[PDB]
Amino acid sequence: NRGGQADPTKSLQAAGSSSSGVAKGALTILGGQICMLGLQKQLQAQRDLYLSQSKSPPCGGNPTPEMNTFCRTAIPDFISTVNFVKKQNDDTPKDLTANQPASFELDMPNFDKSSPFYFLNGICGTVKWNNISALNSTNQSDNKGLVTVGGAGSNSSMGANSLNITSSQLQTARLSRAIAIQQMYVTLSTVAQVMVNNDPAFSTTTSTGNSKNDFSAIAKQQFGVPYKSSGEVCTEYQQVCQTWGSVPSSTGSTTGVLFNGTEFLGAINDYNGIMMPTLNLIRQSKEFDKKSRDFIAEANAKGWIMAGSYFFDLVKLNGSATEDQFDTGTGLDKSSFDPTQLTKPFGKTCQDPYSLLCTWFQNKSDKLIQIQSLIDGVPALGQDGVKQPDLSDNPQRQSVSGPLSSTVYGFVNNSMMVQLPGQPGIKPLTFANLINFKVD
């Protein structure tokens, strides 16, 4: 008793390590935005063709009341209706002392009850994110009073310091993940709009322009591929990939690229930047605590026949006598995105849970398989294309080349290749050749 910041490139390891899925969440929301704008434009076009024939079935003649409804009803904006702050504060109780919800779900897109498209809700995937349970614990919060962070000497969930928080500051502390995903949404909205505008099949205008110069049937201009610092194709991550470029003679000609390969990582590091304050306040001596000394008094009241049970306590004392932040447990990994769901109801006769979609389409799948070819390629770039990328730290990643570089999934795979201006912070396999694996 008397004496015995965050590197932009280092965050790539933080994207996924089997314990964090912020990159997976970003991929999910990006693909979701492709889903909203694409589905919007296809319904818009189909509806225009339907009312342009308002003398013949189905909008004319003797429509079924469902087709009548579709003909009458306009098509709203799904991007506008989707936000996460309002869904979060709907989910959490307004009372600030009760236990907060552990997780939050957000089906994408988002319609309310009066909206007659409620069944389309969730057609474009779903995102999930948990609460920051460090503050969900009992912290003596008050509806209108003042709250104090647990310091040293009590059962605390935050660091060993005490800070004063009012009602407004605390509820805004609850919206950390809310405006987090919100800024993801706003920052990928422009990318999604550009991507949906880049596809000729989505150009509802009957354009008779240069059809021989388009990069592919699904994009006039390629997005581009990672390029090494010297300026050649960065096919494998093993060689450093820094810049963005095109590919010559892709389909007989080369077209301009609209991106830098830094929009995706851009979203991620804005995410990390806005989270930095929140986790910073959660972490707020740290190398010493008074609790380590209190056990002595009971040890006196206690006896010597239990001395051994304080052994690791004693090591906690004599040793002290001789003596880049990333979010973990965010929950965006738990989200899901299935591209096949737009073509699910179609068949001999169309089935639940989106039969009525197929009934407006009169059981055609062309407009929706165009969406699938946008998302991952099939079949406009072959019967088989790129798959869901592995967003975990994979130093053996292979960037997709050629026309398949001009799909959403392949673009994501290529973007998670490049290296931000910061010094590299991803360690490849030390001996990959030492475990070779020869199968074809």
């Binding site: 240069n210 810049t243 080369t254 301009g256 690229v257 830098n260 201006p421």
Partner: peptide
């Protein structure tokens, strides 16, 4: 850095406008 790369993309851009105007001229 970012400025450097989009300047380079702009520099590479200013070669294909001539050929597309050429095709329109065909």
């Amino acid at each position: 850095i970012l400025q450097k790369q989009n300047e380079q993309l702009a520099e590479q851009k200013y070669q294909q406008e001539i050929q597309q105007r050429t095709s329109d001229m065909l």
